[PDB]
Amino acid sequence: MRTLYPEITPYQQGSLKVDDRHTLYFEQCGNPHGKPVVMLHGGPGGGCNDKMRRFHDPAKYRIVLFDQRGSGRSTPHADLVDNTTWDLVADIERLRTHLGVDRWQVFGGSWGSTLALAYAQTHPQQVTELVLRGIFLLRRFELEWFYQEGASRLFPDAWEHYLNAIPPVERADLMSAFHRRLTSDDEATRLAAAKAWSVWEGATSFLHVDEDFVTGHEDAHFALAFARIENHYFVNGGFFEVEDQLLRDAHRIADIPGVIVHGRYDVVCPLQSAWDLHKAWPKAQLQISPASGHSAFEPENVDALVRATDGFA
Amino acid sequence: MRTLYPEITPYQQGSLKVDDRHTLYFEQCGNPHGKPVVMLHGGPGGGCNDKMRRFHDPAKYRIVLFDQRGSGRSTPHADLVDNTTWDLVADIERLRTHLGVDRWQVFGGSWGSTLALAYAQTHPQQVTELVLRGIFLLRRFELEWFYQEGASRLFPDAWEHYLNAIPPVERADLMSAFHRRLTSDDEATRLAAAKAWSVWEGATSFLHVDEDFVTGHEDAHFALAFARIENHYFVNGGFFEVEDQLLRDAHRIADIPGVIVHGRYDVVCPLQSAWDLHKAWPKAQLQISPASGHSAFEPENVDALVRATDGFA
């Protein structure tokens, strides 16, 4: 069973003014002349972390990472203006074009997989391979599974906390009930909601509950951009033309090699979506983790991913 | 079959400052020393009309009417700040107290029946009789029936127009999708949504589609307050503690005489609710209109109401 490569530090860090309002933070790790790869974090609004630098062999890969609009160390933090799927797809191109690469491997998990697919289907010719994890297709049943009813059945105990953040009579469409609070003018009001919404994902992303992950998720500065940008994208349905758009346009990525790693007990994004993606994109290798959850840092998911990365290097 | 009394003008018109922000328009018609009755308009956000002065005998009734917060000729127009069921319940008391009446007949239809009930349950003692029509209990199935799916089956043709206002990916919870638009900063956006939302209740309020009613419902000024105030109360679930509050507390109006007039083919507020109220408050007389719709200006409805009014006079 493979593990993450050793802790590394970017040989270059910077900023890219994508438009007159958003400035993205980017960085590069590994071999400056190695095989190019762009890291797409989840959330949306989560931002990359140091651990995300370790999925690729720094000898063979030129690892490119960056924070998506209003996410992490990109400004303005938690901004919902012009923070849309097709904007993020254009940004990936601005970066690519800016760094001088023609084609590159797209690595993404959770929302990252949603962005990787949207990006690849919009720009097939600039994608060498796709390394997806914890597939999220953003169809309403997926959103509702996590935020309305579904995982609530396995995590009743944690669910009570998410629920309590909303008054009984508004509990019929929890996502919008949260949107009204995460968008409130009162800072206290949107904070209580952002923490409740953020923790929930923190409490259900690993087969075994990770106390530090939960806690890191109730951090007011993280909670704010995560919950707001997450809920923002969900309430608007990913800005897709039609709910099943990623499946509908999957034919554009037909000849793009790739791996689909997904944990069987992933209650954040059910295996269902990886199954459906697989049937629509046969050329990819579905690798199901027998006893893992959503997170990319589950031993089996890490193993599968590192193997995947080495396989294309 | 009775009819509306003749066109009458108020002997007094005014304005009442209920709080440092809201100024309610009110007026009085009829016998200044007659039996007092307060008229609760529907919507919420509809505001009274000239026709509403005519359900009572101007020789026996002191008819009090008023526009509810942000509606009609109350200010500020279309206002959602401190526009809540309990504020409106308080206002009824301010008007009552200000006009020096001790107890009075509450007459309301559609949302008006909701207020009438909320009010009577909070202040049983100041109510002589209740004359309800088009029962609306605000439970979520009622909202979903009219704005998500139900009445859509009988009015396929009209519903296509309501639906077209929202992009397909957001059509899963139409009420919240309209709210985001009716709450937009962009005026053009909230206008388009306000008209679409307001026409829908116009095209379905009478058994026989009334072309003037629809047209009046697409008037920008009326559209804006109606839609925004209506949507605002629904998305928040009538600001009740629990969804079935009006049935829960129906015991408080046990000894209050009343009449429930409902149209069999009322597709805006299904006979369901009139049926359940009636089971919970036995003392009232249920009078179902055989071939009538929602509106109080349905021949059979007008007949039932006028007779009710005269019976209590």
XYZ file of C-alpha atoms in Angstrom, chain A residues 161-162 165 178 182 188-202 214-215 217-228:
34
model
C -26.533 19.478 14.936
C -26.953 20.405 11.266
C -29.267 25.444 12.924
C -29.131 27.801 4.876
C -25.199 32.420 4.795
C -23.391 36.503 13.664
C -26.266 34.938 11.747
C -24.193 33.795 8.810
C -21.460 32.517 11.130
C -23.737 30.171 13.106
C -25.042 28.743 9.844
C -21.606 28.450 8.132
C -20.227 26.512 11.099
C -23.228 24.132 11.218
C -23.034 23.484 7.478
C -19.223 23.180 7.453
C -18.955 20.809 10.430
C -21.498 18.354 8.877
C -19.142 17.612 5.976
C -16.282 17.414 8.482
C -14.248 18.221 12.418
C -12.578 20.916 14.494
C -14.005 22.603 9.942
C -15.607 24.784 12.572
C -12.842 27.374 12.190
C -14.779 30.623 11.535
C -12.466 31.771 8.721
C -12.679 28.423 6.898
C -16.325 27.857 7.771
C -17.253 31.195 6.165
C -15.852 30.672 2.656
C -16.572 26.919 2.563
C -20.227 27.070 3.563
C -21.029 30.167 1.536
